[PDB]
C-alpha cells in the first residue's frame, strides 16, 4: 500500500550538480515528513536531510550544509533533492524515507516523526569516468545435465559502468531458485556480474528461459535467451 | 555527528545480547526519540524500535529497547540465526536534526558448517567470437566465509586474468563468491582442460571444463 | 624604579618629622613620596581583585528550540492536551483555531489547539554579587636606590625585597606594614570605602567578557532568567521573552525564537566599567584608594659614605620625562663603594650653586666592584642648567634646558 | 470543494447571460462564483512566487577575528609597519602610545603602534532584488457537485481535472483558459499591477528567515558588506562596524568584535513583511489580485437528467458555516444515475414554497451506482425552515433555524 | 639555557580534580605564550590550551572546554592547569611548553607564537586503584663472569603502580653502558622493570655499584647495592 | 578538530620522502602557521619547521616545508637512519586555537640486520627470601623488532608466570625487550635448570641457569 520510488541516480562529474527525485503512492503524502538518508557501499547509514509535511522547514546535516537542498511538491506526491558542488564523498545509495506526522491520531502533530517507511533508494556515483554499456552473454546448461535430475543455466553481464544492474527472468515471472551474484570490480575498473537459475533437467525442451537485464545508466536493456547447447 | 555503537557483538543461540548507543545530553539523553533499525545485507533497513521502547506492528517481541542517562541499549533476547545482520540506532537532536550510529554487526555463534556448491561455465560461443574468453566459477552456500581459490591449466597454477570477489553474505546466512578467468582463445585452446578448485576448511572441491 | 614612565604620576612631599602623609592611589597612576632625610619611594596600586563572588541571577541572551508538537480538538470536543505542557523546560501556548468540514471537524467554529516546544539556552550571561569581604588590593612599592634593569622589568626579585615590595589589603584588614630591609619599613592605613561604593553594583559576565553594572539595570533586563547556580539543568522563567508563536493552522502553530540579543546588550552596555578575569577571580581596572603612610621607621641606608672619587660615564644620554624630571644612567669604573654619588645641577660652573632638587634621595652605588650601573632622577629648574656628576676633573657635565612648555 | 471552510469568503452572483464577471482574489480568501444556468465554482489564489531573484548586497551580522599582531616603533624611530596592513581581509588600526625607559625606548614620549587582525564573518544576511517580470501566480479552481473526500484534502484531483484545475499567471501573460472536462472551461484575464510596487523593495534572507524591506533602510545598515556572491572569498567593506580596538599596551592594542547583531536586526524588522522560500524561489503571503472571468464556455454537465427517484440519507448532520450557509452530505442507495438531486428548503411542508437559494447549482450525483455520497450547500432564509431532500415519501427533512447572526 | 619543569602528576580518582604546575627558569617568562599539550601513551599529540604572555586571553580545545582552566603567575614564573571533573580519557603525559611572542624582534607582537621550547612533562593517570610501592631486588653478575673481560649487573623493580619509576647508578654518576628497559604490564596490573649496567670484569671487587630507584607517587626511594660473587 | 596525516612513510636511504598534512580553509589554508615536530620514541618532541617553511637554528637543512591550498607537506631529503621517528604537524586555527595531526611514523628501509644480545638473570637470594622468584631475560640491540620468546624448565614447555614486553625501539634504531618468569621457590628448586630461548630471524639464542 505504501510505495516510494527513487530516480535520478547515475554518474556525475566531480564538483557538478544532480537532481534526485522520489515519487510516492498509496498514502497521504501531505502528512509525512520526508527524509533523505545515504549509505556508502558497505558503510554505515548517514542521515542527509529532512523536510516537513508542508515544507514549512527543512533541516540538513553539517556535511551538506549550503550544498544540498531538499524540497517537495505535495500536489504531485513528489520529493526533490538538489545536490550541488558534489564530491566523491557523496557517492552513496540515497534512500528516500517517510515518517508520518501524527501522534494522538488525527489530533496530535509531531516533529520527531521517526523513520517509518523506506524506499529502495537510488545510487549516486561521483566519478570522472564515463558510462560503459554492458555485454550480455548466455550460459547454456551442461552437455551432461540434460540427462539427470537438475541443471544450472545463467546470464553473464561483462564490462559495464557504473552500478547498479538488475536481472529478472521470463519478463520477471521467475524468481524461485535464482541467484544473482554480486558484481566484481575488475582491475581495469569495470564491473562484471552473473545471474544463474537452477532448474529441473526435465523441463529443458519444454520451458524457455529469458533473462531480462537492465543497466539504466547506459540505458541498455538486452533480454537474452538460453537454449541448451548444440 | 556520530553515535558510539559497538562494532561487533557475538552471542550463542538462545542467549540475550545487548548493543550500545551512547550519545550526549543533546540527542539520547535529551529526548525519548531513539530508534533502532535492522538491515539485512543488500536490503533496505527496517524499523525495529522507535521512541526508546515501543515496537511497530509486526515486529518480534524478542527485541527490547532500554535507555539510561545518555546511553541507549538494544537487547535481542532468544538469539536466532535470523538475527545475523546490521543494527543501527538513530536519534533526534537538539539541533532539529537526526543522527545515526556507527552500527553493530550481530553474528550468531555455533552455526553448522556448510560445504560450497560450485558451478563452472565455459566461454560462450559469442564471447569466443569476440576475441576474448571468460571462464566463470561460482561458489555459493558455504559457511564460514573463508574460501581459497585456485586455477589449473591441466596442471600448474594460473595467474593471468584471475579475478575473484570477496565473500558476500546471502539471505540464508551462507556466503557466495564469484571468480572469473579472462583469457585469450589461444590459451584456451592450447591447454586441454581447465580446473577451478576451491578450498574451504581443508576440503577442496574441484570442477573441470574443456574446449570440447 | 616605577612611575618614571607613568604619565599620571603625582609628586608628594611630606614635612620634616611628619610620620604620616596622606596619598591617593589609583589604577593607571603612581605616587612618588619624597621627604627630607628619607628615601624617595614610589607607590602604585596595580590590581583590585574580587574572589568568592556568589551568583545572583542569570539571563539567557541566545536560545534555540526543539521537539515541536501540537494537539487539537474539534469544536465542543473538549480542550486539547499535550503531554509536556507540564514540563518546566518546555514552552507552550494554548489557542483557538478555525475548524470546519475541510479539516476533519464535523462542525464549523473554534476548536482547541495547544503547541509545545523544548526551550534550550545556548548562551547566558551571569550576574554576581560583590560583598566587600571578598576584596583584595595589590599595592607595589619601590625605592629610588640603584640599577635600571629593575624598572618595570625584573619584577621577579621583589620577594627578595630590599628595594621592591608588595602589600595586599582587604576591607577586613586595611592595616599593613611593608619592610624594606636596610631602608626600614613603611606603614599603610588605607581607607577603602572611599575607593568606590560597591553596594549598588553587580559583576556581569558574558562570553568571557566582564563588566560592572548597576543593580536596577540588571533587574530590568527583558530576557528569560533564573536565580541561582545551575542545579544541574536550569529552569528558565519568562521563556516567552525570546520565543513567540505564529500561524493558525488546523492542527498546529509555528514556534520561533528571536535572534541572539548579544549585540543589543553590548550596545546598551558600553556605558559601564570593564574588567578581566584571570583567573576564576575578577580583576578590576576602575578603582580608587586613599591611604595614609607611616614613615617614622623609614630611613636612608644609615651611613655618610665616603664620596665616589672615581669617574662616571653616561651610558644613556639623559632624557626628559613627561613631567620635566631628568633620568640619568651612569656607569662607574671605581672600586671604593658603597660610596655616595656626587651629583647636582649647576647654573654656573664657577660656584656650582646647587639649583633644583633631587628626586632620587641620596644616590648611593650599592656595589663595591667596578663598572656598576645606576639611575638617578633630578628636578631641574627652568631655563638652562648643567648636570654635574663626579668630583675633580674626572666629573662629567651635560647641558640641559627645561623650557617648561 | 474549497472555500466552505474559508473564513474570508466572498459570495458573487453574475446575471443570466453574464459571460464575464469581475472578481478580487486575495491570499487567505476565496471567491465563490454563482450564475443563473451555470455551475457554481470556487476560485482561490494559493501562492504568489518570485523566481530568478538576483542578489544585490550581503551584510555580516556575526563575525569573529583571529591572528592578532602588533608592531611598535620608539619615539622618532619612524612609523610602524605590519605585513598585513595591505591585506584586504585584515583590519588594522594605527595609533600613538606612551613610551619611556621602562618599556625599552631611550626617550620618553609618543611612539608608533599598528595593530592588525584577520576578519572572518560567521553569519551574514543576504539581500536580493525583485523585478516584477519574475512573478508567478497560482490560482486554483474547484467545482460544486461531487463527493466529500475531495474537500481541501485530496488536492490530487488535477490529474482527472473535471472538478479541480490549476492556472499559472505571469505579468507578461495574464490571460489563461482552464478546461473542466464535461463542465466546459473558464477564461481568466488577471490584472496584477494592482498588487504592490516592487521597484523599491528587497527580499531579505537571514538564517532561513525572510522579509521584504524598503531599499533606503537596507542601504543605510551599519555592518560590513559585500556585493557577492561570494566569488570564492569575499572582501568585506567597513570591517570597523563590528570590530574595535581597545587598550594601549607598550607593544600592542587589543582587537575585539561586537556581539551578534542578529537580535538587533530581528528587533528593528518586525514592522515589515514576511516570506518563505520553497524552493530556491520566494513565496509571498502578502498579496492582492483583480481578475476577470470569461464564462461563455462554462456549462452544466449537458443532460436533462431524470430526477433521482430513490431514497437519500444524511451521513453527516447539516452544519452552519460562518456565513449562514448549510452543508449537507448525503448517501444515495439508488441506481438511476447520473440523476438530478431534488432538494430545496420549505417554510411550509404542504405547498413546499421554495424559499432561499441553492449555492450548489443543480445537484447531480456523479455516479450511477448505489450508496454514493454527495455534498450540497444551501443559503437559508432567516427564521425557521425545513431542509427537504428527495421526492415522495422517500424524502428526508431536517429542521433548521437561521438566526442570521 | 631554557628550563621548564613540570609537577603535580600522579594518580587521580575518576571524576575528581588535580592541579598541574610548571616552573620556568632561564628566560623572560613575561614574553612567552604558554601551552599545555598532552599525549596518551603510544598515541598522537593533542593540544590542550594556551594562555598568552600577560594572561589577557586563554583558549582551550573543544575536548576540555568547561572542564580545564589555565592560568599563570608571572611574578613567580609559574603556570597552572586546573583539571576538574576528570575522566580516564584524560590519562596522558602533559607537556608544559612555551613559545616566544616576539616577532619583528623587540618590535612586533604575535599571537601565533609557535611551539618553541618543550618541557619534560608530567604523567597524569586517572585510575581508581591505589598507588603501590615497588620492591627493589639486586641482580648479581654470573658465576662464570667474575673471571674474564666484561659482565652485566642490574636491579629489578617488582610490582608497582603506577608509572613512572626512575633508576640512576652511583647516585647518577654512571650512565655509560646503562640500559633501563621498558616496564611490563603484568596481568595483575602492576608494572615491573629492570635496569642493567655493563662493566669490565676487572673492576668487580674494587668498584662498587648502587642503583638509585625512585617512585615518587608512592614516595619510595630505595638505593640497593650489588656486589660480585664467587659462589 | 583533527589534521589528517599519513600513518607510515617508507623510503630507502638517500631517497626523498613526503608527508601529508591536510586540513581546512580555517587552519592550513587560512594561515601560514603550520609547524612540524620530530619525536624520537620516549623523548620530548622537537620543533623541526615553523611557519610553513622556516627552520630554527640547529636543524638539518634536510627537512623542508611546503604548503599548497589546504594541504601542507613535509619533505625529508637525504634519508638517514637518524630520521627513523614520529613526525607531527600542527597548525593555528580560525578559532584562535592550535591543532595537531595524527602523526606519521618514518621508517628507513634496507637497514642491516642486528643480532640480539640476551642476558639471563636468576632470582636473587633476596627475592627467594621474600617468598617469590623471578627469572629475568633481557634482549637488547636487535633489528628488526621481531623476537619470539620461549621458556624451558630444563626441557618441556613453560606456561605459568610468563610475561613478555612488546618490542621497544631504542636510541640507536635497534630494539629491546624484557621477559619475566614468575615462579615459587619450590618450582625453582624442583627443576634442575631453566633456559630462556629467544628466536629472531631464524636463529634462536639460548641461555641457561640452574640452582647449582
On whether any CB of chain C is under 8 Å from the CB of E74, the answer is yes
Q: What dotted CATH number matches D8-52+131-195+283-294?
A: 2.60.98.10
Q: Which helix (H) or strand (E) holds F125?
A: helix F125-129
Domain boundary among E95, E125, E155: E125
Chains that touch F (3 or more CB pairs under 8 A): D, E
Instruction: Give how many domains chain F has, as a whole number.
Output: 2
Cα dist. B151→B62, B136, B175, B196 in Å? 46, 11, 20, 5
Same-domain check for residues E93 and E111 = yes
Q: Is residue A130 part of a domain?
A: no
Asked whether the bond before B144 is cis by omega within 30 degrees of 0, the reply is: yes
Considering only the beta carbons, identify the residue of A95, A135, A194 that sits closest to B138.
Answer: A194
3-state secondary structure string across chain B: CCEECCCEEEECCCCCEEECCECCCCCCCCCCCCEEEEECCCCCCEEEEECCCECCCCCCCCEEEEEECCEEEEEECCCCHHHCEEEEEEEECCCCCEEEECCEEEEECCCCCECCEEEEECCCHHHHHCCCEEEEEEEEEEECCCCEEEEECCCCECCCCEEECCCEECCCCCEEEEEEEEECHHHHHHCCCEEEEEEECCEEEEEEECCC
Q: Pull the grid cell for residue C299.
A: 630611613
**Domain with F164 in it:** 117-209
Same-domain check for residues E53 and E95 = yes
Measured over the CA atoms of residue A114, residue A117, residue A120 and residue A124, the dihedral's sign is: negative
Same-domain check for residues A104 and A164 = no
CB contact under 8 A, F33 and D67: yes
CB contact under 8 A, C120 and B95: no
**Domain with A51 in it:** 3-125
Residue of chain B whose Cα is closest to the Cα of C68: B96
Same-domain check for residues A49 and A95 = yes
Q: How far apart are alpha carbons C202 and D75 in whole angstroms? A: 41
Considering only the beta carbons, identify the residue of A119, A120, A184 that sits closest to B163.
Answer: A184
Considering only the beta carbons, identify the residue of D67, D71, D249 that sits closest to E104.
Answer: D71
Domain boundary among F108, F126, F161: F108
Q: How far apart are alpha carbons E72 and E68 in whole angstroms? A: 14
Residue of chain B whose Cα is closest to the Cα of A185: B165
Q: How far apart are alpha carbons A4 and A120 in whole angstroms? A: 7
On whether any CB of chain C is under 8 Å from the CB of D270, the answer is no
Report yes or no: D255 and D115 within 8 Å, Cβ to Cβ: yes
Report yes or no: F184 and F177 within 8 Å, Cβ to Cβ: no
On whether any CB of chain E is under 8 Å from the CB of F40, the answer is no
Domain boundary among B108, B133, B155: B108
E strands, C52-182, where? 55-73, 90-99, 109-128, 135-143, 165-169, 175-179
Is D8 strand, coil or helix?
A: strand
Q: Pull the grid cell for residue A125.
A: 556515483
Q: Pull the grid cell for residue E181.
A: 628497559
CB contact under 8 A, E108 and D82: yes
Beta-bridge partner residues of F182 = F134
CATH number at residue F54: 2.60.40.10
Ordered alpha helix ranges (H), A168-217: none
Residue with cell 603556570: E79
Same-domain check for residues A187 and A108 = no
Report yes or no: F169 and F175 within 8 Å, Cβ to Cβ: yes
Q: How far apart are alpha carbons B97 and A111 in whole angstroms? A: 10
Chains that touch E (3 or more CB pairs under 8 A): C, D, F
Report yes or no: A76 and B135 within 8 Å, Cβ to Cβ: no
Q: Pull the grid cell for residue B172.
A: 540464508
Q: Which helix (H) or strand (E) holds D264?
A: helix D262-267
Q: Pull the grid cell for residue B87.
A: 543494527
Most D CBs within 10 Å: which of A65, A67, A75, A78, as the mutation test of the D interface?
A75
Q: How far apart are alpha carbons C9 and C255 in whole angstroms? A: 59
Q: How far apart are alpha carbons C364 and C146 in whole angstroms? A: 7
E strands, D209-288, where? 210-214, 225-226, 243-246, 254-257, 273-277, 282-284
On whether any CB of chain B is under 8 Å from the CB of A222, the answer is no
Q: What dotted CATH number matches D312-402?
A: 2.60.40.350
Same-domain check for residues F132 and F75 = no
Is C37 strand, coil or helix?
A: coil
Report yes or no: D332 and D315 within 8 Å, Cβ to Cβ: no
Q: Do domains C8-52+131-196+284-294 and C312-402 have the same CATH topology?
A: no
Q: Is residue B1 part of a domain?
A: no
Q: How far is CA C291 from the centre of its chain?
A: 18
Q: Pull the grid cell for residue C53.
A: 563572588
CB contact under 8 A, D322 and C261: no
Same-domain check for residues A121 and A18 = yes
Could you give phi then psi for residue D262, rounded to 5 degrees?
Answer: -60, -45
Report yes or no: A5 and A120 within 8 Å, Cβ to Cβ: yes
Considering only the beta carbons, identify the residue of C158, C279, C280 that sits closest to E75.
Answer: C158
Q: How far apart are alpha carbons C54 and F16 in whole angstroms? A: 62
Resolution (A): 3.4
Q: Is residue A56 part of a domain?
A: yes
On whether any CB of chain C is under 8 Å from the CB of D316, the answer is yes
Report yes or no: A197 and A176 within 8 Å, Cβ to Cβ: no
List the Cα angle C245/C249/C255 in 5-degree steps: 25
Task: Give chain F positions within 8 Å (CB) of E46.
Answer: 100
Q: Is residue E231 part of a domain?
A: no
Name the burial class of residue D313, with classes exposed (0-12), middle (13-18) and buried (19+) by CB atoms within 10 angstroms of its CB: middle
On whether any CB of chain D is under 8 Å from the CB of A82, the answer is yes
Beta-bridge partner residues of D289 = D25
Measured over the CA atoms of residue C142, residue C146, residue C148 and residue C149, the dihedral's sign is: negative
Residue of chain A whose Cα is closest to the Cα of B89: A45
Q: Pull the grid cell for residue D112.
A: 608608533
Same-domain check for residues F129 and F76 = no
Q: What dotted CATH number matches C8-52+131-196+284-294?
A: 2.60.98.10
Residue of chain D whose Cα is closest to the Cα of A79: D279
Which is nearest to D363 in space by CA: D378, D342, D386? Answer: D342
Residues with Cβ < 8 Å from D343, sequence gap 6 or more? D328, D358, D363, D376, D378, D387, D388, D389, D390
Most D CBs within 10 Å: which of C101, C206, C265, as the mutation test of the D interface?
C101
Q: How far apart are alpha carbons C102 and C94 in whole angstroms? A: 22
Half-sphere exposure (Cβ direction) of B94: Cα atoms closer than 13 Å: 16
Q: Do strands C8-13 and C29-35 pair parallel, antiparallel, or not at all (unpaired)?
A: parallel
CB contact under 8 A, D260 and C260: yes
Q: How far apart are alpha carbons B11 and B104 in whole angstroms? A: 13
Same-domain check for residues A104 and A146 = no
Q: Is residue A144 part of a domain?
A: yes
Q: Is residue F2 part of a domain?
A: no
Q: How was this structure determined?
A: X-ray
Could you give phi then psi for residue E181, rounded to 5 degrees?
Answer: -80, 155
CB contact under 8 A, C263 and D261: yes
Name the burial class of residue C216, with classes exposed (0-12), middle (13-18) and buried (19+) by CB atoms within 10 angstroms of its CB: exposed
Same-domain check for residues A115 and A54 = yes
Residue with cell 663598572: C371
Q: How far apart are alpha carbons D23 and D29 in whole angstroms? A: 12
Contacting C residues, span 89-148, partner chain B, CB-CB under 8 Å: 118, 120
Q: How far apart are alpha carbons C221 and C127 in whole angstroms? A: 11
Q: Pull the grid cell for residue F117.
A: 644480545
Q: Pull the grid cell for residue F175.
A: 630494539
DSSP label at residue A140: P
Cα dist. F190→D7, F123, F163, F185, F193 in Å? 104, 15, 21, 8, 9
Q: Evaluate whether chains B and D are touching (3 or more beta carbon pairs less than 8 Å apart).
A: no
Name the burial class of residue C286, with classes exposed (0-12), middle (13-18) and buried (19+) by CB atoms within 10 angstroms of its CB: middle
Same-domain check for residues F148 and F205 = yes
Ordered alpha helix ranges (H), C144-277: 215-219, 262-267
CATH number at residue A26: 2.60.40.10
Q: Is residue B40 part of a domain?
A: yes
On whether any CB of chain A is under 8 Å from the CB of B53, the answer is no
Same-domain check for residues F168 and F84 = no
Which is nearest to F198 in space by CA: F156, F164, F172, F171? Answer: F164
CB contact under 8 A, D278 and A77: no
List the Cα angle F192/F196/F202 in 5-degree steps: 135
Q: Is residue E130 part of a domain?
A: no
Report yes or no: D66 and F91 within 8 Å, Cβ to Cβ: no
Domain boundary among B53, B75, B108: B108
Instruction: Give how many domains chain E has, as a whole number.
Output: 2
Which is nearest to E180 in space by CA: F178, A184, D342, C55? Answer: F178
Which is nearest to A212 in space by CA: A147, A141, A155, A143? Answer: A155
CB contact under 8 A, C155 and E75: yes
Distance from CA of B91 to the nearest CA of A (A): 9
Considering only the beta carbons, identify the residue of F33, F92, F94 that sits closest to D120.
Answer: F94
DSSP result, D30-92: EEEEEETTEEEEEEEEEEEEE-S--EEEEEEEEEEEEEEEEEEE-TTS-----GGGG-TTEEE
Distance from CA of D155 to the nearest CA of A (A): 6
Name the burial class of residue E214, with classes exposed (0-12), middle (13-18) and buried (19+) by CB atoms within 10 angstroms of its CB: middle
Distance from CA of A26 to the nearest CA of D (A): 12
Residues with Cβ < 8 Å from C206, sequence gap 6 or more? C61, C125, C126, C262, C265
Q: Is residue B153 part of a domain?
A: yes
Q: Do strands E32-39 and E45-51 pair parallel, antiparallel, or not at all (unpaired)?
A: antiparallel
Domain boundary among E106, E125, E144: E125
Domain limits of chain C? 8-52+131-196+284-294, 312-402
Rg of chain B, C-alpha, whole Å: 24
Same-domain check for residues B103 and B121 = no
Q: Is residue B3 part of a domain?
A: no
Considering only the beta carbons, identify the residue of D156, D166, D280 that sits closest to A69.
Answer: D280
Asked whether the bond before D194 is cis by omega within 30 degrees of 0, the reply is: no
Q: How far is CA E152 from the centre of its chain?
A: 27
Amino acid at each position: 500500500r505504501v510505495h516510494l520510488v527513487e530516480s535520478g541516480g547515475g554518474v556525475v562529474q566531480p564538483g557538478r550538480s544532480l537532481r534526485l527525485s522520489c515519487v510516492a503512492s498509496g498514502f497521504a503524502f501531505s502528512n509525512y515528513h520526508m527524509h533523505w538518508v545515504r549509505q556508502a557501499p558497505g558503510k554505515g547509514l548517514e542521515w542527509v536531510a529532512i523536510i516537513w509535511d508542508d515544507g514549512s522547514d527543512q533541516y540538513y546535516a553539517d556535511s551538506v550544509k549550503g550544498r544540498f537542498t531538499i524540497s517537495r511538491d505535495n500536489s504531485k506526491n513528489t520529493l526533490f533533492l538538489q545536490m550541488n558542488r558534489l564530491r566523491a564523498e557523496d557517492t552513496a545509495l540515497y534512500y528516500c524515507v517517510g515518517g508520518s506526522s501524527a501522534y494522538n491520531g488525527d489530533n496530535g502533530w509531531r516533529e520527531a516523526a521517526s523513520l517509518d517507511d523506506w524506499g529502495q533508494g537510488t545510487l549516486v556515483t561521483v566519478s570522472s569516468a564515463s558510462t560503459k554499456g554492458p555485454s550480455v552473454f548466455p550460459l547454456a546448461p551442461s552437455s551432461k545435465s540434460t540427462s539427470g535430475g537438475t541443471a544450472a543455466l545463467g546470464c553473464l553481464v561483462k564490462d559495464y559502468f557504473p552500478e547498479p544492474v538488475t536481472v529478472s527472468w521470463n519478463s520477471g515471472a521467475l524468481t524461485s531458485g535464482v541467484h544473482t551474484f554480486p558484481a566484481v570490480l575488475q582491475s581495469s575498473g569495470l564491473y562484471s556480474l552473473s545471474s544463474v537459475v537452477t532448474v529441473p533437467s526435465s523441463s529443458l525442451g519444454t520451458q524457455t528461459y529469458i533473462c531480462n537485464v537492465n543497466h539504466k545508466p547506459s540505458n541498455t536493456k538486452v533480454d537474452k535467451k538460453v537454449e541448451p547447447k548444440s | 555527528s556520530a553515535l558510539t555503537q559497538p562494532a561487533s557483538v557475538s552471542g550463542s543461540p538462545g542467549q540475550s545480547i545487548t548493543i550500545f548507543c551512547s550519545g550526549s545530553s543533546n540527542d539520547v539523553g535529551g529526548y525519548n526519540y531513539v530508534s533502532w533499525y535492522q538491515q539485512y545485507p543488500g536490503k533496505v533497513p527496517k524499523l525495529l524500535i522507535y521512541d526508546v521502547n515501543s515496537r511497530p506492528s509486526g515486529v518480534s517481541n524478542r527485541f527490547s529497547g532500554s535507555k539510561s542517562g545518555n546511553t541507549a541499549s538494544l537487547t535481542i533476547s532468544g538469539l536466532q540465526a535470523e538475527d545475523e545482520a546490521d543494527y543501527y540506532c538513530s536519534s533526534y537532536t537538539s539541533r532539529r536534526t537526526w543522527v545515526f550510529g556507527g552500527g553493530t554487526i550481530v553474528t550468531v555463534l555455533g552455526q553448522p558448517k556448510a560445504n560450497p556448491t560450485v558451478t563452472l561455465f565455459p566461454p560462450s560461443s559469442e564471447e569466443l567470437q569476440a576475441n576474448k574468453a571468460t571462464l566463470v566459477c561460482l561458489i555459493s552456500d558455504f559457511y564460514p566465509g573463508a574460501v581459497t581459490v585456485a586455477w589449473k591449466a591441466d596442471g600448474s597454477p594460473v595467474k593471468a586474468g584471475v579475478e575473484t570477489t570477496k565473500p558476500s553474505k546471502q539471505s540464508n546466512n551462507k556466503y557466495a563468491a564469484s571468480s572469473y578467468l579472462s583469457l585469450t582463445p589461444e590459451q584456451w585452446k592450447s591447454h586441454r582442460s581447465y580446473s577451478c578448485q576451491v578450498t574451504h576448511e581443508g576440503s577442496t572441491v574441484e570442477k573441470t571444463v574443456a574446449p570440447t | 624604579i616605577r612611575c618614571i614612565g607613568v604619565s599620571n604620576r603625582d609628586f608628594v612631599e611630606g614635612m620634616s618629622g611628619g610620620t604620616w602623609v596622606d596619598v591617593v592611589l589609583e589604577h593607571g597612576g603612581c605616587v612618588t613620596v619624597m621627604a627630607q632625610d628619607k628615601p624617595t619611594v614610589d607607590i602604585e596600586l596595580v590590581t583590585t581583585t574580587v574572589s568568592n563572588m556568589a551568583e545572583v541571577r542569570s539571563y539567557c541572551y541566545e536560545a534555540s528550540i526543539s521537539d515541536m508538537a501540537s494537539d487539537s480538538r474539534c469544536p465542543t470536543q473538549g480542550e486539547a492536551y499535550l503531554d509536556k505542557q507540564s514540563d518546566t523546560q518546555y514552552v507552550c501556548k494554548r489557542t483557538l483555531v478555525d475548524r470546519g468540514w475541510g479539516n476533519g471537524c464535523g462542525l464549523f467554529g473554534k476548536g482547541s489547539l495547544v503547541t509545545c516546544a523544548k526551550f534550550a539556552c545556548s548562551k547566558k550571561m551571569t550576574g554576581k554579587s560583590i560583598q566587600p569581604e571578598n576584596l583584595e588590593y595589590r599595592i607595589m612599592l619601590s625605592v629610588h636606590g640603584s640599577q635600571h634593569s629593575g624598572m618595570i622589568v625584573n619584577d621577579t626579585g621583589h620577594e627578595t625585597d630590599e628595594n621592591r615590595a608588595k602589600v595586599e589589603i582587604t576591607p577586613n584588614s586595611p592595616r599593613a606594614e611593608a619592610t624594606l630591609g636596610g631602608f626600614g619599613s613603611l606603614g599603610l592605613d588605607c581607607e577603602p570605602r572611599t575607593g568606590l561604593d560597591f553596594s549598588d553594583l553587580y559583576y556581569l559576565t558574558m562570553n568571557n567578557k566582564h563588566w560592572l553594572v548597576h543593580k536596577e539595570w540588571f533587574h530590568d533586563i527583558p530576557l528569560p532568567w533564573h536565580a541561582g547556580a545551575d542545579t544541574g539543568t536550569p529552569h528558565w522563567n519568562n521563556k516567552e521573552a525570546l520565543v513567540e508563536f505564529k500561524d493558525a493552522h488546523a492542527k498546529r502553530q509555528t514556534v520561533v525564537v528571536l535572534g541572539s540579543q548579544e549585540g543589543a546588550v553590548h550596545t546598551a552596555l558600553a556605558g559601564a566599567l570593564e574588567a578581566e578575569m584571570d583567573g576564576a577571580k575578577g580583576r578590576l581596572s576602575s578603582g580608587h584608594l586613599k591611604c595614609r603612610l607611616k614613615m617614622d621607621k623609614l630611613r636612608l641606608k644609615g651611613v655618610s659614605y665616603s664620596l665616589c672619587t672615581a669617574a662616571f660615564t653616561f651610558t644613556k644620554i639623559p632624557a626628559e620625562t613627561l613631567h620635566g624630571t631628568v633620568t640619568v644612567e651612569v656607569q662607574y669604573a671605581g672600586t671604593d663603594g658603597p660610596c655616595k654619588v656626587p651629583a647636582q645641577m649647576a647654573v654656573d660652573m664657577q660656584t656650582l650653586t646647587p639649583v633644583g632638587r633631587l628626586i632620587t634621595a641620596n644616590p648611593v652605588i650599592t656595589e663595591s666592584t667596578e663598572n656598576s650601573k645606576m639611575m638617578l632622577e633630578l628636578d631641574p629648574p627652568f631655563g638652562d642648567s648643567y648636570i654635574v656628576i663626579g668630583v675633580g676633573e674626572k666629573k662629567i657635565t651635560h647641558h640641559w634646558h627645561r623650557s617648561g612648555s
